[PDB]
Design a protein around this nucleic acid. Structure first.
Ligand SMILES: [Mg+2]
Ligand SMILES: [Mg+2]
Ligand SMILES: [Mg+2]
Ligand SMILES: [Mg+2]
Ligand SMILES: [Mg+2]
Ligand SMILES: [Mg+2]
Ligand SMILES: [Mg+2]
Ligand SMILES: [Mg+2]
Ligand SMILES: [Mg+2]
Ligand SMILES: [Mg+2]
Ligand SMILES: [Mg+2]
Ligand SMILES: [Mg+2]
Ligand SMILES: [Mg+2]
Ligand SMILES: [Mg+2]
Ligand SMILES: [Mg+2]
Ligand SMILES: [Mg+2]
Ligand SMILES: [Mg+2]
Ligand SMILES: [Mg+2]
Ligand SMILES: [Mg+2]
Ligand SMILES: [Mg+2]
Ligand SMILES: [Mg+2]
Ligand SMILES: [Mg+2]
Ligand SMILES: [Mg+2]
Ligand SMILES: [Mg+2]
Ligand SMILES: [Mg+2]
Ligand SMILES: [Mg+2]
Ligand SMILES: [Mg+2]
Ligand SMILES: [Mg+2]
Ligand SMILES: [Mg+2]
Ligand SMILES: [Mg+2]
Ligand SMILES: [Mg+2]
Ligand SMILES: [Mg+2]
Ligand SMILES: [Mg+2]
Ligand SMILES: [Mg+2]
Ligand SMILES: [Mg+2]
Ligand SMILES: [Mg+2]
Ligand SMILES: [Mg+2]
Ligand SMILES: [Mg+2]
Ligand SMILES: [Mg+2]
Ligand SMILES: [Mg+2]
Ligand SMILES: [Mg+2]
Ligand SMILES: [Mg+2]
Ligand SMILES: [Mg+2]
Ligand SMILES: [Mg+2]
Ligand SMILES: [Mg+2]
Ligand SMILES: [Mg+2]
Ligand SMILES: [Mg+2]
Ligand SMILES: [Mg+2]
Ligand SMILES: [Mg+2]
Ligand SMILES: [Mg+2]
Lengths: 205, 80, 85, 81
RNA sequence: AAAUUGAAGAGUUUGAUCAUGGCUCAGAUUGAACGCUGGCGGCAGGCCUAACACAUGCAAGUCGAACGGUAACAGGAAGAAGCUUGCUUCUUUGCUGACGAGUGGCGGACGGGUGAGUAAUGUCUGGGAAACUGCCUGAUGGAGGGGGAUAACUACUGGAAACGGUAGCUAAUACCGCAUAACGUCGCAAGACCAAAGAGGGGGACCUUCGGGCCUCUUGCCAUCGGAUGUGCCCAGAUGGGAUUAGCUAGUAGGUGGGGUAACGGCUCACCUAGGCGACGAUCCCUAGCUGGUCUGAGAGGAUGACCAGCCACACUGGAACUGAGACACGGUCCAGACUCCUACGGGAGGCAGCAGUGGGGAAUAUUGCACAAUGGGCGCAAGCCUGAUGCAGCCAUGCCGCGUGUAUGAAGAAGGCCUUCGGGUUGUAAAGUACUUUCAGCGGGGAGGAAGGGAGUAAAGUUAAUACCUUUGCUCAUUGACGUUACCCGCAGAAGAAGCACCGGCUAACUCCGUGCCAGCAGCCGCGGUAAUACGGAGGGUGCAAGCGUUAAUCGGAAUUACUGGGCGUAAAGCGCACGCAGGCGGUUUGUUAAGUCAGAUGUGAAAUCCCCGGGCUCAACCUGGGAACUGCAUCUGAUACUGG
């Protein structure tokens, strides 16, 4: 129930940097970055009108590590709720606990935060939350358990994630390893390289 | 206090009873037209005081016969 | 019969049918008498059997065999049928 | 009779009883007249595991309904508590 | 405050274009079947056809506080034991705990199953008058004195057996009279008449025939008028198709009376009229249980009625009735008919469409399991006893939902596979190695909640003669789990036990090589295949999905392709050959009245659940759950008079 394959292949076919790796070396210096995977690299995939919507839905799915039956549900909630639907689809994929671990930088990547959660180590508020697709509300003070404060590989990600862009809709404390999801994240605090309104038009056929 | 219904008579050749046409005004559930629809009732009356072509005002009571449950009160516009 | 509580209330049924047919044909006999004396004009000899027929319907009602309105349709048909001789 | 009794709903191993005022011929989950409260024995703290319309469970006993034993224990709980 | 926020097109007629018109695909969906494949868990779903036939257990019992009694258990006081000087007989003794058979009271009319019939006898919505109503509850009164049989038993007898027959003895809350009798029935009246039953727990001293009257409370009985509750009945709307079915009906339509059920009534007879339904679709033929809802749809609409729940109908087919408050009765009764099984040939017995289960049909649907521990239900004052309803278990990927099969570094771009302009590109940072983590399964350890009550006491108080018994009220004591080696946390070990499927010509995301060469073959439409095939068959790479993936069956959408919202008729399918015309649809213009259409408000009803909005609880979701809008309707009383009808 997760993509177990190679990961630079999925950065390659989407043709962008989707942060599937750490940052210890850049994406360019580990593989070719424009060329599409397969025999037919350098045949540049200039593709149809439906294809530019499909390669836009798959980018925002493959960022977070969702499968399509979960993602269709995440669309239906964001058509049900009030407000917009781009600005209510990009809220639910940021409220996941497997993503508020990573945006606070308790883990190096987006598919390690799933292991830190789903190996029973990330207690929201004072009870362990094993299940990775939790819907973290505002003000929940997510911390790190004391069995997994002593890991080298969580502070190794702390020193890594202090060097990226720090977010605005969060408040991490460094030494105690304890976050605070403050408010719900706005539109432009999640980067606008996601063409937002091409995930609406697929499912709204 | 009582719930009468007007109507018009059709057949009163039988003894001590008339039959009354009542003319309700339905609206068709789809096409939006305003049709007429009629219902035919038996009306018991004593004294046999009604004929064809006459406007009566009936009211509901216990079943006097097999297919009959209505007795009249008055005969307005008594003639053709 | 397969259940003991069906056998027992199968033989508590004839023991009630025999009595409920005796004490009902008694009543129908005593109404047949006040219908025998009802076309022969005996206003002083139909009234006798009607006064013999007051308690033997107003008792078989109260012991639960007919209902009280059957015990009061008789005594308002026969009273008119007697007093209009 | 007519009687005030529980009637079980909810999910397996986690019950949730409503109370009903219904005819004691009829079934458990079946027909009733006035659904007048509930009883949630797997409630949490600071939420309400009982809520009984004690006006209606008086007006429906003055017209003669035998309150069954669990509803009687519920009234004994919530009136004193 | 919120309860909504909702609409996509493409291919195909011609050398080619526009137009009309079909056919086909994209998406959602399931009581689902089949193929390839398979780790776990949570909550729901599982004979759609043969209403076919059924072996085997099991699903309706209780009450000794209604009564005779002892068929056994086990204590008693006897006392005849071998007498051991203490006891381990047993007839006998119902005196006690209780209790096999039988009389009686209440329950089997509930709960449980299926949809054969049923086009209005049903169902849904809203109105009514002429009715009964066990248990529960309120008020006012009663509750005297007699009686006859009879099962159980005993004796004798028939029959293969089922089941009887005869003659004796015995009781009550079973059964029947007399008395009594009103606020009830009958009656304009005077008057006439109608019921019943006890038991139990305690008792001071008065009676005390040794049982008890006597006092006390608890519950039980009878009668009337009331309340709820369930049911019977009636009327106007609505609930498939057909006109290549256009005429049906004699108890049929109405009346006067007799009879009849609880009540009205052609409900059933006896007479007198000649009527009733029908083009707003009667009769007849085909098909079907309906509704809350469900799936789709932007909506209006179209199809459907499984699980949950309200109503009706049915119980081997075809009938009729008894008991009873309630049935014309699933696990009752008699009568035929078909089919099974026993028989001594005379005669008998049975009805899974209750939970399980075998045969059979079929593409296809489970275990002959545990427990009354909860919530219900029957009897019981109570304890307790029964409960295949229900609560949980077993099997199945059948559906919805969650998690896992590692995470991070890692370039010598390893080997091997394939492509190749013979330089290289590609699998591919993927594997290896190097460090890191242990959810789930695996072995251990601890341990929530579903459990309220009931019991044995003690304290006062309410009662009465009573400091008794009892009833409610505060406490103290030992207490009661089917699931259950439970949900759930903490320990041990090690990347170990956990990835498959469809497609790659266009529509539609993904391209090359070899092996066949109008053959073998694919196909949802257009088309491919005749030696360079991006379509057939293999491999390499690739894309979409994931404990699923695909193909067929079915509905809806796209289909504005049955169009009210929303289409056409000179040539594409389409204007009767032309007229006169009753039923039907529509009606210039002004004042006045009426309130039917219409419009506003209010009460009554539209059951719960589900859909939707804000909230709460199981680590989140599914699932569960509180309150409210919704249920576009329908009836009643008020109002309004512009338009339409009179
Ligand atoms: Mg899934
Ligand atoms: Mg009786
Ligand atoms: Mg009469
Ligand atoms: Mg508790
Ligand atoms: Mg929106
Ligand atoms: Mg076309
Ligand atoms: Mg062509
Ligand atoms: Mg297999
Ligand atoms: Mg059968
Ligand atoms: Mg058998
Ligand atoms: Mg016994
Ligand atoms: Mg029965
Ligand atoms: Mg049928
Ligand atoms: Mg009864
Ligand atoms: Mg008696
Ligand atoms: Mg008397
Ligand atoms: Mg008559
Ligand atoms: Mg029936
Ligand atoms: Mg039958
Ligand atoms: Mg009877
Ligand atoms: Mg049976
Ligand atoms: Mg018989
Ligand atoms: Mg069965
Ligand atoms: Mg079989
Ligand atoms: Mg077969
Ligand atoms: Mg088996
Ligand atoms: Mg139980
Ligand atoms: Mg049993
Ligand atoms: Mg499963
Ligand atoms: Mg190589
Ligand atoms: Mg484990
Ligand atoms: Mg417990
Ligand atoms: Mg393929
Ligand atoms: Mg393409
Ligand atoms: Mg193919
Ligand atoms: Mg060739
Ligand atoms: Mg070739
Ligand atoms: Mg193809
Ligand atoms: Mg449409
Ligand atoms: Mg349409
Ligand atoms: Mg179609
Ligand atoms: Mg057209
Ligand atoms: Mg033409
Ligand atoms: Mg012409
Ligand atoms: Mg003309
Ligand atoms: Mg006009
Ligand atoms: Mg009006
Ligand atoms: Mg509702
Ligand atoms: Mg919540
Ligand atoms: Mg007008």
């Amino acid at each position: 129930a997760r993509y177990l394959g190679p990961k630079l292949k999925l950065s390659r076919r989407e043709g962008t940097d989707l942060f599937l790796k750490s940052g210890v070396r850049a994406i360019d210096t580990k593989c070719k970055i424009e060329q599409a995977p397969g025999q037919h690299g350098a045949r540049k995939p200039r593709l149809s009108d439906y294809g530019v919507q499909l390669r836009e839905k798959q980018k925002v799915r493959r960022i977070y590590g969702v499968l399509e039956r979960q993602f269709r549900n995440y669309y239906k909630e964001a058509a049900r709720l009030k407000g917009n639907t781009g600005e209510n689809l990009l809220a639910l994929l940021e409220g996941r606990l497997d993503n508020v671990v990573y945006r606070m930088g308790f883990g190096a990547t987006r598919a390690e935060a799933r292991q830190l959660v789903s190996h029973k180590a990330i207690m929201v508020n004072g009870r362990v939350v094993n299940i990775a697709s939790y819907q973290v509300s505002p003000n929940d003070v997510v911390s790190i358990r004391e069995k997994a404060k002593k890991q080298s590989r969580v502070k190794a990600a702390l020193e890594l994630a202090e060097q990226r862009e720090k977010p605005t809709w969060l408040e991490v404390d460094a030494g105690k390893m304890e976050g605070t999801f403050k408010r719900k994240p706005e539109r432009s605090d999640l980067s606008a390289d996601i063409n937002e309104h091409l995930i609406v038009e697929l499912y709204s056929k | 206090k009582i719930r009468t219904l007007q109507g018009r008579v059709v057949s009163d050749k039988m003894e001590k009873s008339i039959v009354v046409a009542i003319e309700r005004f339905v609206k068709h559930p789809i096409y939006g037209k305003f049709i007429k629809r009629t219902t035919k009732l038996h009306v018991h009356d004593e004294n046999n005081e009604c004929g064809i072509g006459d406007v009566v005002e009936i009211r509901e009571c216990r079943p006097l016969s097999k297919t009959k449950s209505w007795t009249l009160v008055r005969v307005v516009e008594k003639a053709v | 019969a397969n259940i003991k509580s069906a056998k027992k209330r199968a033989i508590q049924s004839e023991k009630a049918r025999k009595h409920n047919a005796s004490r009902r044909s008694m009543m129908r006999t005593f109404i047949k008498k006040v219908y025998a004396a009802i076309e022969a004009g005996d206003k002083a000899a139909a009234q006798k059997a009607f006064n013999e027929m007051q308690p033997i319907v107003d008792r078989q009602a109260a012991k639960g065999l007919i209902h009280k309105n059957k015990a009061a349709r008789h005594k308002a048909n026969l009273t008119a049928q007697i007093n209009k001789l | 009779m007519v009687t005030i009794r529980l009637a079980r709903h909810g999910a397996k191993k986690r019950p949730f009883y409503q109370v009903v005022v219904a005819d004691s011929r009829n079934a458990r989950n079946g027909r009733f007249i006035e659904r007048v409260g509930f009883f949630n024995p797997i409630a949490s703290e600071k939420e309400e595991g009982t809520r009984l319309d004690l006006d209606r469970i008086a007006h429906w006993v003055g017209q003669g309904a035998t309150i069954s034993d669990r509803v009687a224990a519920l009234i004994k709980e919530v009136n004193k508590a």
